[PDB]
Structure formats: C-alpha cells, structure tokens
C-alpha cells in the first residue's frame, strides 16, 4: 500500500456523496460533515489521465491474409496461424499486466492523496491538537463551526489558539 487508506482509517463514509475525501467534526454545536474539493479533484484528475491514455485504438490498418471461404495452402496457412497466435499471446500478456499494474497504482495514489491531506491538517494545527490514531485530531481549545471551516480551507491560524491549547496539553 502506501500510508493507509484501509489502515488507521478503519472505514469510509457511505454518507459522503459530496466528494472523495472530507472532514467530519464534532463540537458543542452538533455534528458536521463536509467534503474536500481540491484533494478529491487531484485524485479524479490522475485517474482520468490514466483512462484517457489507456482507452485508445490504433490508426494502423490490418488486412486479410488468409481465407475463410477457400483455404490458403497449408504451409503458408500454418505460418500465419502460428504468427497470429503469437501476437495474441503478447497482447493478452500486455493487457492483463497493464490493467493489473494500473489498478495497483490507482489504489495506491488514492491512498497517497488521503495521507497527503491528513498530514497537511496535522501540520496545520501545530501543537494545538493531538493525533487520535484513527485519522482524527483531538482539539484542545473547543473549536466552533467557524474554527472548523478555517481548518477546512487551510486558513486556521495555530498561534491564535496556541495558549489555551498548550495549557490543556
């Protein structure tokens, strides 16, 4: 894997239909859940990049070289069949390896994006919060809805809550 999407974060949120990643906060005003648009779009861009690169066709034209109606001579027929089968094997190998390799990277990059957003919030809170261990951040200055929103759009000033938080350890 990477840094655990299916690790310390135990499960995903089926209720999160607003994006691919997001925050779920809890305070004195109730329950809150909002998606993160930029990190979601980062993931979406990369996968879209893959798909559009993979979904593609040749502009190379191949013709008929044997005959379904009146069979060609055996010796040239067997060479042709032997060659075609060989190309089939190569493309069968390429195809299955391609898809397998891409799927490994797709899953891992999604892991990557989740880890990147997570450790970003961690640096965003400085010493005002502590790592829960399940992807959560226990805040030590009772953050209100406006405070939470400042964390979401990366504007949270750590040094304006620092005194209160470090006191409460």
């Amino acid at each position, epitope marked *: 894997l990477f840094g655990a999407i299916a690790g310390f974060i135990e499960n995903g949120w089926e209720g999160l239909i607003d*994006g691919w990643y997001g925050f779920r906060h809890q305070n004195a005003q109730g329950e809150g859940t909002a998606a993160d*648009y*930029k990190s*979601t*779009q980062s993931a*979406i861009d990369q*996968i*879209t990049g893959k*798909l*559009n*690169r993979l*979904i*593609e066709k040749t*502009n190379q034209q191949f013709e008929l070289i044997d005959n379904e109606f009146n069979e060609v001579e055996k010796q040239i027929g067997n060479v042709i069949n032997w060659t075609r089968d060989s190309i089939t094997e190569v493309w069968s190998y390429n195809a299955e390896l391609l898809v397998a390799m891409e799927n490994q990277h797709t899953i891992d990059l999604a892991d990557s994006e989740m880890d990147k957003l997570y450790e970003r919030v961690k640096r965003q809170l400085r010493e005002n919060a502590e790592e829960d261990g399940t992807g959560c951040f226990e805040i030590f200055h009772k953050c209100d809805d406006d405070c939470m929103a400042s964390i979401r759009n990366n504007t949270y000033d750590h040094s304006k809550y620092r005194e209160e938080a470090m006191q409460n350890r």
Partner: antibody
Amino acid sequence: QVQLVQSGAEVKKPGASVKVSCKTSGYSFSTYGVSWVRQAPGQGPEWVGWISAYTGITDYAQKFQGRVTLTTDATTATAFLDLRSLRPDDTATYFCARDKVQGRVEVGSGGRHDYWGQGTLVIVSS
Amino acid sequence: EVVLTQSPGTLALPPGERATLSCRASHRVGSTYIAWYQQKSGQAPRRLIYGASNRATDIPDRFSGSGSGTDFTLTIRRLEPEDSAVYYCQQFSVSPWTFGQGTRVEIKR
C-alpha cells in the same frame, strides 16, 4: 436545456478594467467549470483561461497572467471574467464555454467546450 | 507550446463534393484532446467533433474527423450551402490550449 448567456457589449478606455458575466442554466454548477476564449476582429480564436466552479482552481495563459481574474457564482451559478490595464489589443469578442467534468471521473472529451455563450464585444478605445 | 497549423487557408468547392481539412500539430497529441469547430461570420463557434473522431450532439453525419499523432483531419463528405464557414481545430491536452489559424470553406457556380 444548457445555455450560456453573457452580459451586453462594452466600451472601455485604455488602462481601464472590464467585467464580462456568464449566466448558467441547464446543468448543475461546479460539475464542469468554464473556459474563456477571445476573438479579435477578423482574427481567429485564442484561449484565455479556465476556472473550476468545483475547486476554484484557475489556469491562465502566460499573456494574461497578472491582469486577468476568473471567478464564479456568489451562489447563482454564474462565472465572471475580469480584465484590467486594457490595451488596444484587448479589443475582441469574449466567449465563455462550459468545460471539463469536475467532481466525477469520466472518459473522453464530451464535456470539453460543449456549450458556448453568444459572445461579448469589448471595444478598448479612447 | 503546441502549435496547430491548418491547411489549406481557403478551400473552394461546389455543393455536394467532398471537402478535406487538415490540422497538423507540432507535438504528438492524444486523440481525445482534439476538437473541431465551425464558425460563421458573427456567431459563436459550434463544436463539431470532440476527441478527434466523435460527433457532437445533433451534428450531421457528413462531418467526420479522423487521424492520430500529429495529423488530424475533418472531412465534409458532401458539402451543403450552409457549410460555408470557417473551421478551427483545437488542442487541450497541455496548456496553453491552442487553436489552429483556421480554414475557410467556400462554394461555387
């Protein structure tokens, strides 16, 4: 029915600041975002910039970096194009076009400049 | 950047004949990131082809795009009077998204 309706034509003095609007109807907003193309009289089309209505991320061409600012609906699903320090070269027809799927993975270029606005002439002269 | 150069500058052909419009890129662009547009004097450009060969909604099947790599082609199988316009190719693989200088199509008789 998806339609892009832009503001009326405009006349500005050189060195001023213009603001073209683009009202959105038909689709949902923040599912695509907008590309802007401008066309000088008797000349071809040239791409100006793109903004996501979903993330807010903007991408400009080098020519306009620093004097163009793209923004999106206060809440009414409408995109804006803000140009300033208007040269006489900035005299052109400014088109907005709905462009590129956002909060979703989709193959192909079906949502790439698929619907345009009627246009907006900007005459920059004294 | 990617330079799209179209040819010819001007194409003049009688109605019902076959028109072939070229767009040649400086760099290899994936077929998905290429579009063709029609524009008449005064109006907004309507999208004809997207992804190098896919027809847009309600576009007549006499407009067919083809090609790959650096060579792309818009074919008007049988010209109609209302096909007299200017045609631009576009690339949006890598920014800046660039346009071809265009090809004008004119009829006859």
